[PDB]
């Protein structure tokens, strides 16, 4: 299987999974919207109304296609969506990560000139840590974000549900960035628990805070925000872009075909997996990867691969 599209499913998996493209007229929501030309890039599935195309309900004048993704590893319901990050794909190159130097897949890949690629594990840990030294950076129109690891310019994550990949818990706390900021730069503390969320002032020689107006039952560390414990917190944390040069020059991620079935060069269009011969004999409609003519599990797959 060939999937060139990943989301995170905040159920039941809670994780990154493959994702299924999903169209669908705009008008009538129907699944019915049938495509002029099929998406070439990640503009194409994200932006409001850039593709147009025929929808087949009976009394719908929709002609604009709406997008959207749905996890893979289970029956979904019709409207259990999930995000898209554009941002991790398959390592069919088998680039190494730039941290770990393992071969690992699916990968994230920064937007910064080397494109630099990271393992899920590693990038879960290169946030984890950030969130917990508090070293974010702040964008003033978007909010919170990280560059790449390797501190490359251009390189800010702009679709910030990348950081889903943080967990449930350490990104609840990601959300609360601006107003546990503010806290701490008073002196105070932030309580970690979800349902909580009390502003605290504990002593300022003490480590260990107790959530106690009206708090909840809760003694956590002050540092890692972690229920309380003895003596230092997790290794990663007192341990505060330091990167091996070598292993950061590995890890970067760096026209027609033949018809099937006629041998007729057919010409690609942008990343687009859908090819239609010219040839009037043949006009077969194929998959530039795949080789077969083209179906739905082609669609949901791999529509395009950018
Ligand atoms: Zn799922
Ligand atoms: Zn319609
Ligand atoms: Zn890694
Ligand atoms: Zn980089
Ligand atoms: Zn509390
Ligand atoms: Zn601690
Ligand atoms: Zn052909
Ligand atoms: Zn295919």
Redesign the pocket.
């Known amino acids: 299987i060939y999937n060139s599209f990943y989301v995170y499913c905040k159920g039941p998996c809670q994780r990154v999974q493959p994702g299924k493209l999903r169209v669908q007229c705009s008008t009538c929501r129907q699944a019915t919207l049938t495509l002029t030309q099929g998406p070439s890039c990640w503009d194409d599935v994200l932006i409001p109304n850039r593709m147009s195309g025929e929808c087949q309900s009976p009394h719908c004048p929709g002609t604009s296609a709406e997008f959207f993704f749905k996890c893979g590893a289970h029956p979904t319901s019709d409207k259990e969506t999930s995000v898209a990050l554009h941002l991790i794909a398959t390592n069919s190159r088998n680039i190494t990560c730039?941290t770990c130097t393992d071969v690992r897949s699916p990968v994230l890949v920064?937007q910064?000139?080397?494109?630099?690629v990271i393992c899920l594990d590693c990038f879960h840990l290169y946030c984890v840590t950030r969130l917990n030294d508090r070293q974010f950076v702040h964008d003033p129109q978007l909010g919170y974000s990280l560059?790449?690891?390797?501190?490359?310019p251009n390189?800010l994550i702009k679709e910030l549900h990348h950081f889903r990949i943080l967990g449930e818990e350490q990104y609840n706390r990601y959300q609360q960035y601006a107003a546990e900021e503010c806290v701490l730069q008073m002196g105070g503390v932030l309580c970690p628990r979800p349902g909580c969320g009390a502003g605290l002032l504990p002593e300022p020689d003490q480590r260990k805070v107790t959530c106690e107006g009206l708090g909840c039952g809760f003694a956590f560390c002050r540092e890692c925000k972690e229920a309380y414990h003895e003596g230092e917190c997790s290794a990663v944390f007192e341990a505060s872009y330091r990167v091996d040069e070598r292993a950061?020059e590995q890890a970067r991620w760096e026209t027609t075909k033949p018809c099937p079935r006629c041998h007729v060069p057919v010409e690609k269009n942008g990343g687009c997996m859908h090819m239609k011969c010219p040839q009037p004999q043949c006009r077969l409609e194929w998959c530039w990867n795949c080789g077969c003519e083209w179906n739905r599990v082609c669609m949901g797959d791999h529509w395009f691969d950018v």
């Open positions: 730039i920064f910064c000139n080397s494109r630099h560059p790449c690891v390797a501190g490359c390189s950061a």
